[PDB]
Design a protein around this ligand. Structure first.
Ligand SMILES: Cc1cc2nc3c(=O)[nH]c(=O)nc-3n(C[C@H](O)[C@H](O)[C@H](O)COP(=O)(O)OP(=O)(O)OC[C@H]3O[C@@H](n4cnc5c(N)ncnc54)[C@H](O)[C@@H]3O)c2cc1C
Ligand SMILES: CC\C=C/C=C/C=C/CCCCCCCCCC(=O)O
Length: 423
């Protein structure tokens, strides 16, 4: 437990940091400060304007099991009121097909899925807990495909891959199953499969903008932190405009990047240096032959097709001159990084192939996405080490790396961090 008059400095005004403020405030910790580097809040929930409506450069959707996000909507008064999500499936040559009608693959998938469901509910009980401080089963530390191979459920990858690889989280040849299954737990997977998906008319960013406004201390923006030191039981935060002292540090920003403006200790340097991330690239496009529906391309989710468009988003049904966003990955451990130029050429070429040629790209973003560690690093005890450092020199660790790269997970983690260490 931590004293209620502690001065608590929260770095980052994305969901993770905003929720930290919310839940600290609600537990009676009123002397918090959220420091944001940019001029805006919401982080990767980023919904800019175009032609009188908001489009999504980052996060788009949620599922009914997003309980922490419902608590936030309860507080802001926002509602799930966005346009309905609908999808078709394309081959890499633009051909529309329906995977579940595949007479060989169809049955293999449903048998694997059913078998996995049973395994998850028994053998792997506890897998779905938020965070990684409850040590998961050792099998879950293997790359997702190996985890499946071991259990004779390879064909379950067909259902899990679409809202995972296409959604920027990487490839099953290497991403530890622990991550896959805390995000796509059986319930969430079934919700997605069923199309039971939340969206917001004013963008996922809106509820975070409004959360910020409801906070007793809305974020301080445009804060360029040049150095943080932690001597004598205090946190000294140096910025370009001021430097100040706190009692507690909550990190919701990238931890490898933290090493560069901090008095990082040996463990912090050793362990945070192992963090790897996804280079997930979005392009906001105007197109001819406006799609009628969103399109996924399982062929382009293969590592051999890295940099190609894996999915694209049909948001506003009624205006053929509104924004269609495309999604691609620029990195894989077995491959050298694809350049943004070569990938932007693939956006144009792929969309042309799909029959929805691009007339214009008006915004582009490669995001710092899904920070995580390797299976080898997971197995070697990365989370036991880092969770065991919680509170060392009044510093706490949070955000995506500590849970999973989605807004419900990071908010959930921020909620429990207060329960775990402060209350
Ligand atoms: C294209 C895309 C689609 C996505 N789709 C979904 C989806 O459908 N559903 C879902 O749940 N999630 C989705 N996500 C993931 C989700 O947006 C993120 O997991 C979530 O925003 C993570 O929040 P965070 O606070 O942990 O980190 P971030 O959102 O990355 O925010 C971190 C904040 O800290 C700030 N910061 C960074 N460095 C510093 C510094 N040194 N000093 C001060 N501040 C700093 C940043 O500017 C930012 O405001 C998507 C993301 C992208 C990019
Ligand atoms: C519950 C969702 C959790 C995390 C999502 C993370 C990332 C999503 C990234 C890009 C999503 C691409 C949008 C494609 C439109 C989907 C419409 C549909 O599938 O029916």
């Amino acid at each position: 437990s931590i004293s209620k008059d502690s001065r608590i400095a929260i770095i980052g005004a994305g969901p993770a940091g905003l929720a930290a403020g919310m839940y600290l405030e609600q537990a009676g910790f009123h002397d918090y400060t959220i420091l944001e580097r940019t001029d805006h809040v919401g982080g990767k929930c980023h919904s800019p304007n175009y032609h009188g409506r908001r489009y999504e450069m980052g996060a788009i959707m949620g599922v009914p099991s997003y309980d922490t996000i419902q608590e936030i909507m309860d507080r802001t008064g926002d509602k799930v009121d966005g346009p309905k999500l609908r999808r078709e499936f394309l081959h890499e040559d633009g051909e529309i097909y329906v995977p579940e009608k595949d007479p060989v693959r169809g049955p293999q998938v449903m048998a694997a899925v059913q078998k996995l469901g049973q395994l998850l509910a028994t053998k792997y009980q506890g897998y779905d807990a938020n965070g990684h401080y409850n040590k998961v089963h050792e099998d879950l530390m293997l790359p997702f495909d190996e985890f499946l191979a071991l259990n004779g459920c390879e064909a379950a990858r067909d259902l899990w891959i679409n809202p995972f690889t296409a959604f920027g989280y990487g490839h099953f040849d290497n991403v530890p199953a622990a991550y896959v299954l805390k995000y796509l737990d059986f319930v969430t997977m079934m919700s997605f499969a069923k199309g039971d998906l939340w969206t917001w008319a004013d963008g996922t960013q809106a509820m975070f903008e409004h959360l910020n406004a409801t906070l007793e201390h809305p974020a301080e923006r445009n804060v360029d932190i040049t150095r943080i030191t932690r001597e004598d039981g205090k946190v000294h935060i140096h910025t370009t405009d001021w430097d100040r002292e706190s009692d507690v540090l909550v990190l919701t920003v990238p931890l490898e990047k933290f090493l560069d403006y901090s008095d990082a200790d040996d463990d912090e340097r050793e362990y945070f240096s192992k963090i790897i991330h996804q280079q997930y690239m979005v392009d906001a496009c105007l197109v001819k032959e406006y799609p009628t529906i969103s399109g996924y391309v399982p062929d382009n989710m293969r590592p051999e097709r890295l940099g190609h468009v894996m999915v694209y988003y049909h948001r506003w049904a009624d205006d053929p001159h509104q924004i269609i966003t495309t999604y691609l990955l620029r990195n894989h451990p077995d491959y050298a990084d694809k350049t943004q130029e070569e990938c932007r050429q693939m956006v144009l070429d792929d969309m042309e192939t799909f029959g929805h040629p691009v007339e214009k790209i008006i915004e582009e973003q490669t995001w710092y996405y899904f920070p995580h560690v390797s299976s080898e690093d997971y197995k070697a005890g990365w989370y036991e080490k880092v969770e065991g450092m919680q509170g060392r020199r009044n510093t706490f660790y949070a955000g995506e790396i500590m849970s999973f790269g989605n807004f419900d997970e990071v908010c959930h983690y921020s909620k429990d961090l207060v329960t775990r260490f402060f209350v």
